Design a protein around this ligand. Structure first.
Ligand SMILES: COC(=O)[C@@H](CC(C)C)NC(=O)[C@H](C)NC(=O)[C@@H](O)[C@H](N)c1ccc(C(C)C)cc1
Ligand SMILES: [Co+2]
Ligand SMILES: [Co+2]
Ligand code: NA
Length: 263
C-alpha cells in the first residue's frame, strides 16, 4: 500500500532534499584533523535551524540526543557527536543528515576522508558509493526492488567486502520511515514493483571485513563485530516516468540528477 507523491509533494521533497544536501556541502570545510564531532553537530544544527529554517528529523527521534549522526571508521551507523572525539588523519567519517522542511523529509549521507587517505579506507568508500550509484541507475518504473538489492550485494561481495543486513533504506515523505523497506541485499521476500511518484532512500552500509555488527552499551552506536572499517552513502530519490530523480544530489556527486531510460 505504498505512498504515491503528487507533483506538489515532490516539489516539497526537492526543497527538503536540497536542504539536506546543502548541510553536507556546508560542513565540508570544517571536517579536518582536530575538529570534534560535537562541534560538527552544533555547526549542522545551527545551520539547519537558523539559516535553513528547518528542523533535524533525528533530534529526539526515539530519544536520539543529537542533530546528525557522525560515524567514524569501524562505526557502522548512529555514531553520536561528542565534544571529546577529535577527527584524525586517515579517518573515514560518515555524516548522515535528515531535515524536515514544510512537512517533508530529505535524508542523505556521505563519507569524508580526513587528511591523507589510507588506501583501504579510500577503496571502501569508493566501492560503497559505486554500489549506491549502480542501484540508482536501475531505478525506473517496473523494476523490482529485489533486483536492486541483489545487484548491490553482488557488486560489493566481488570486492571482498560485505553488506550490512540490519539497517535498510526506506520510503520517506511526511514520515521519516515509510514503506517500502529497501534492502541492500537479495531476499525472496522482496517484491516491490516501482511506480512513478514513489520516494525512498538507498543507503548501503559496506564493511571491509565481515557483515556482522554489534550495538554498543550506549544503546546507539553500531560497530562492526570484527572492528573492520565500514562506510555508507545515502540519497533520497523519486521514481519518475522513465527513471529517477536524485533529490539530495550535491555538486561533488558524479552521477546525473535525472536518470532517464527513454530513447
Ligand atoms: C532497527 O533499527 C533501525 O532500523 C532504525 C533506528 C531507529 C528507528 C531507532 N532505523 C535506522 O537506523 C534507519 C534505517 N536509518 C536511517 O534512515 C538513516 O538514514 C537516518 N538518517 C537515521 C539515522 C539515525 C537514526 C537514529 C539513530 C536516530 C534514525 C534515522
Ligand atoms: Co540518513
Ligand atoms: Co535514511
Ligand atoms: Na564507519
Amino acid at each position: 500500500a505504498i505512498s504515491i507523491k503528487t507533483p506538489e509533494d515532490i516539489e516539497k521533497m526537492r526543497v527538503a532534499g536540497r536542504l539536506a544536501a546543502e548541510v553536507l556541502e556546508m560542513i565540508e570545510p570544517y571536517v579536518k584533523p582536530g575538529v570534534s564531532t560535537g562541534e560538527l553537530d552544533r555547526i549542522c544544527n545551527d545551520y539547519i535551524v537558523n539559516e535553513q529554517h528547518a528542523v533535524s528529523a533525528c533530534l529526539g527521534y526515539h530519544g536520539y540526543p543529537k542533530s546528525v549522526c557522525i560515524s567514524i571508521n569501524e562505526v557502522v551507523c548512529h555514531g553520536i557527536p561528542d565534544d571529546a572525539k577529535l577527527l584524525k588523519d586517515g579517518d573515514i567519517v560518515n555524516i548522515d543528515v535528515t531535515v524536515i522542511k514544510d512537512g517533508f523529509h530529505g535524508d542523505t549521507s556521505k563519507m569524508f576522508i580526513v587528511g591523507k587517505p589510507t588506501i583501504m579506507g579510500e577503496r571502501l568508500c569508493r566501492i560503497t558509493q559505486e554500489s549506491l550509484y549502480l542501484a540508482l541507475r536501475m531505478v525506473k518504473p517496473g523494476i523490482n526492488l529485489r533486483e536492486i538489492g541483489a545487484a548491490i550485494q553482488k557488486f560489493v561481495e566481488a570486492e571482498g567486502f560485505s553488506v550490512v543486513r540490519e539497517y535498510c533504506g526506506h520510503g520517506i515523505g511526511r514520515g521519516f520511515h515509510e514503506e517500502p523497506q529497501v534492502l541492500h541485499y537479495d531476499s525472496r521476500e522482496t517484491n516491490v514493483v516501482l511506480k512513478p511518484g514513489m520516494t525512498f532512500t538507498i543507503e548501503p552500509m559496506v564493511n571491509a571485513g565481515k557483515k556482522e555488527i554489534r550495538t554498543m552499551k550506549d544503546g546507539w552506536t553500531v560497530k562492526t563485530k570484527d572492528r573492520s572499517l565500514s562506510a555508507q552513502y545515502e540519497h533520497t530519490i523519486v521514481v519518475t516516468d522513465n527513471g529517477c530523480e536524485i533529490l539530495t544530489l550535491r555538486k561533488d556527486d558524479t552521477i546525473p540528477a535525472i536518470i532517464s531510460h527513454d530513447e
